[PDB]
Design a protein around this ligand. Structure first.
Ligand SMILES: [Ca+2]
Ligand SMILES: [Ca+2]
Ligand SMILES: [Ca+2]
Ligand SMILES: [Ca+2]
Ligand SMILES: [Ca+2]
Ligand SMILES: [Ca+2]
Ligand SMILES: [Ca+2]
Ligand SMILES: [Ca+2]
Ligand SMILES: [Cl-]
Ligand SMILES: [Cl-]
Ligand SMILES: [Cl-]
Ligand SMILES: [Cl-]
Ligand SMILES: [Cl-]
Ligand SMILES: [Cl-]
Ligand SMILES: [Cl-]
Ligand SMILES: [Cl-]
Ligand SMILES: [Cl-]
Ligand SMILES: [Cl-]
Ligand SMILES: [Cl-]
Ligand SMILES: [Cl-]
Ligand SMILES: [Cl-]
Ligand SMILES: [Cl-]
Ligand SMILES: [Cl-]
Ligand SMILES: [Cl-]
Ligand SMILES: [Cl-]
Ligand SMILES: [Cl-]
Ligand SMILES: [Cl-]
Ligand SMILES: [Cl-]
Ligand SMILES: [Cl-]
Ligand SMILES: [Cl-]
Ligand SMILES: [Cl-]
Ligand SMILES: [Cl-]
Ligand SMILES: [Cl-]
Ligand SMILES: [Cl-]
Ligand SMILES: [Cl-]
Ligand SMILES: [Cl-]
Ligand SMILES: [Cl-]
Ligand SMILES: [Cl-]
Ligand SMILES: [Cl-]
Ligand SMILES: [Cl-]
Lengths: 153, 153, 153, 153, 153, 153, 153, 153
């Protein structure tokens, strides 16, 4: 909405644990107006939720695999059911319908190659797909849930 | 650590706003032991942080671009500086060193093609790269920050 | 036909608004012979039509997408109907049957990625196609309707 | 601007030869208001120009080649000069800076393969380019200079 | 067979018009032994035939197209009939069953792109093929019917 | 030139061994006019030469390899010298400057993979080339030196 | 198991012909404890077998071909039978289910291209496969059956 | 050499542990002639060595990676040193100079993705390579050191 909302969101995306009175002080605001701004943004759905982010090394999901899918020609309903069943897998953490050479791109997290192999077998039992090409990440250099706020309007 | 820690984490990854006494009740625990478990997991870094997640449509970052990079042969220090300068861009929300045909995979968020074009010009002024191939997402079907907890050990 | 016809066409391809008497003077001709040359070229179909060209930024069609299609094996009649239904789309501004890896190449104009996504859904409801690979233009550096006239014979 | 402007433009893109009084009647308007609308659209640059379109078979430019270019890493000024020198070629009728695997896409028109070969030699004397991949069209199924007007706003 | 046979063949592959007595002198042989060597090589089929070679520019077949074919899975009999019907086309001057990404490679000669287009339509009416990718030669730098004779044994 | 010349050429491309009097009878001509037609076609270079064609299995050159080359950017003189040195190799029986993904296509004949390996080492000592991709033929289904004569004009 | 087991295995992987008393001396052990360690490793299956390794040049299997296979979508049982029938071929010396663009990778040994061609025909009679791409090795630079022992644990 | 040598080798490739007297009985031979045949084959190098084969799961090298390398143009000596330094790595168990799109193919064994990542860093410190594309095996379906003996001659 305005520049003060942006200052609030910039901190909230980094850390939602601050007492609302300490966030207020960090953004140059009294407590009530700060709280009221946050409430409006929650109601409007700008802030969609607040979550704990876990360490993938510590919950044993340290490998990222990017799975590239090509589909055959299919009805709007088949695509709706294909994307519902891929979405149910807890290991599929991101799922995109792409343009370009590939139809869908998934990001999958698992502890190791063998865990990936067994995930893939469960996936492929439930769907049918012309071509799957999996690519394993060697390192996660950056992963953030912070959006760029320079474009807000 | 144990199965009760998993029940706690499963809720925390979905919603970190609950009062600790209400989370306790949802996991079958008294309040203090629940709190003490959460504290241990924070100290140990299993829980790395708690954050607000924003709606990309509402902060004007609705387009996702997957940028595939190939590099020339370079020193361990060049790769260290290349990955530091790509990491600074607020639009680069995910950044992986890959195995396979592509050296690096970025996920970039922007409002539109023109915003992507201008991001790309800023990136390429700061780095040098044999080949960049960008692919635009048509739809984000799933995006979650919840890790699968079935592998915890 | 001859070199004076070429001088006439070179101007007409740039600007068809000139009074025929001013075009005559610009090509070194009296008015009637100039007019008579233009008439012959219209009758013969060398000049096929005269049109207004609009600014794509101002009519909200600023994104160009090049859509690469591969088809299955099909009858001469299926190809005739496939190309008739793709041709009806007002967004398909150019459409070629190609040689090489790709069977067909389309140029599509739309305001944005979302408009492209919805165009693609309408297209794909009406046709069936093994593989579509879309590539978005970052910039239109040159677009002219002027043909090279150095080869005329 | 409004729906009557759209009706005017829809005809103008098809045929700019009509007397303004006959266009008026076709769009449900008196002559002066029709003329005044057209003038505004010219002044504003919505209508950028009016041109004769020629028959490529009759001016001996019947072959279309789509030329895909990849460049090395280069300064913003090199790209500015590269695109100025490619733009000067009368055979390069369309020229795009692309996203995806290819850096630039050209559409080139010539009478035959040999004319293409000689064009290519002239181009490559003047520029330096990692990779050029040319693809010849077998047929031009549709070519229009009419933009879709459904998106106007 | 021996080194004198090789000297004979080296000339015969270049020019079969010489009187047998002049070939004899050029290879250091009397006429009868030279003739008798040539006869043996014809009978044994080392020399398979003698032919006129024509100038492709002068018989209006100046364009070479290399056609890469991929087939579906098929019976040994389907492949036998597919290769018999492709072989009948007078424009298919060379035809290979390949290893690697492509199943078959053809060399086709025609006067121009349009002649190629019409050849392709006739071919594809008679066969069914997953993928055809045609590539046009810009120049024939070397074409010889002379085999290397350094390996003879 | 005319249809009788075509009848003559159709036989000559198959077999140049016939006495001119027997060819005459096969084409419906007296001997002298037949001879005179053949002479004209030789003088004009329509018939470029007459050669013995040998059996590749019998001269120990039974393997065909198609070698795909990509070059860097180079002067018109470098390309002239590159193509002169590749042309000298007796194993390079066909050599084309291509359009498309590949810059040059060679057809190479050798007895076996090891002979190919040693040819490749000699070639690469003498030239420098970004990318060579070799593909081995499994079978030569058709190889003819007969051009299609349906296009003659 | 421990570092002395590693010293034993490092020699055994190189040469299993030594009398157990000479191996003992080479690893710093008395004979019985050395023997007892070897027995334990056989019983546990760390040592799976001892074999003669033959020279491929001397048994006429000097060509290596890497065969890349893509399959259609198939049941867990079809994949089980496909992999059983490919496994029976004595020429298929290594066989992997891959991730990435290719579904399976085989290493095949034969004397020559023709032997490969005939192997391929036998394979393809028994299985059905969307795409096979074969690549021939020019040289075997290293081939060892020794595993790296630095990771043992 | 002969069919009895083949019977001996067929067993030796499977199991070299048999007492020579028991192998003799299995091949239909008295002991001395069997021994003498084996000695000849060792002296001639048909049998190159006898080795223990270990279980990759039990020595913690359970992941196979196929590493595809492309090199720049280089001297015969650079290629000699490149292949010597890649050969020294104990994890590179197979190493081939290839024909086709890829210059070299390696088979690498490691316990996991992280071990592969660290191997790759050591390799790339010691060599310079245009392009490396790694592909991870999901399963080793067959791995044998037995050559096909049907081609022996
Ligand atoms: Ca796959
Ligand atoms: Ca690009
Ligand atoms: Ca697509
Ligand atoms: Ca090219
Ligand atoms: Ca095609
Ligand atoms: Ca190569
Ligand atoms: Ca193949
Ligand atoms: Ca790589
Ligand atoms: Cl949400
Ligand atoms: Cl919330
Ligand atoms: Cl697409
Ligand atoms: Cl929170
Ligand atoms: Cl963190
Ligand atoms: Cl926290
Ligand atoms: Cl890699
Ligand atoms: Cl957009
Ligand atoms: Cl006009
Ligand atoms: Cl028209
Ligand atoms: Cl007109
Ligand atoms: Cl084609
Ligand atoms: Cl303009
Ligand atoms: Cl105008
Ligand atoms: Cl890009
Ligand atoms: Cl042409
Ligand atoms: Cl023959
Ligand atoms: Cl003959
Ligand atoms: Cl193959
Ligand atoms: Cl002759
Ligand atoms: Cl000649
Ligand atoms: Cl001649
Ligand atoms: Cl090209
Ligand atoms: Cl071979
Ligand atoms: Cl075993
Ligand atoms: Cl054993
Ligand atoms: Cl995969
Ligand atoms: Cl042994
Ligand atoms: Cl050895
Ligand atoms: Cl031995
Ligand atoms: Cl190669
Ligand atoms: Cl792993």
């Amino acid at each position: 909405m305005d520049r003060l909302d942006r200052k609030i969101l910039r901190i909230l995306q980094e850390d939602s644990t601050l007492a609302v009175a300490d966030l207020a002080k960090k953004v140059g605001l009294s407590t009530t107006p700060c709280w009221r701004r946050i409430q409006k943004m929650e109601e409007d759905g700008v802030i969609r939720r607040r979550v704990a982010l876990l360490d993938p090394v510590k919950v044993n999901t340290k490998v990222t695999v990017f799975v590239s899918i090509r589909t055959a020609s299919h009805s709007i309903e088949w695509l709706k059911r294909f994307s519902e069943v891929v979405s149910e897998f807890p290991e599929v953490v991101e799922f995109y319908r792409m343009s370009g050479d590939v139809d869908y791109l998934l990001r999958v997290v698992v502890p190791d190659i063998a865990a990936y192999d067994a995930f893939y077998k469960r996936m492929i039992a439930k769907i049918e797909i012309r071509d799957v090409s999996s690519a394993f990440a060697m390192e996660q250099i950056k992963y953030t849930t912070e959006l760029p706020l320079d474009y807000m309007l």
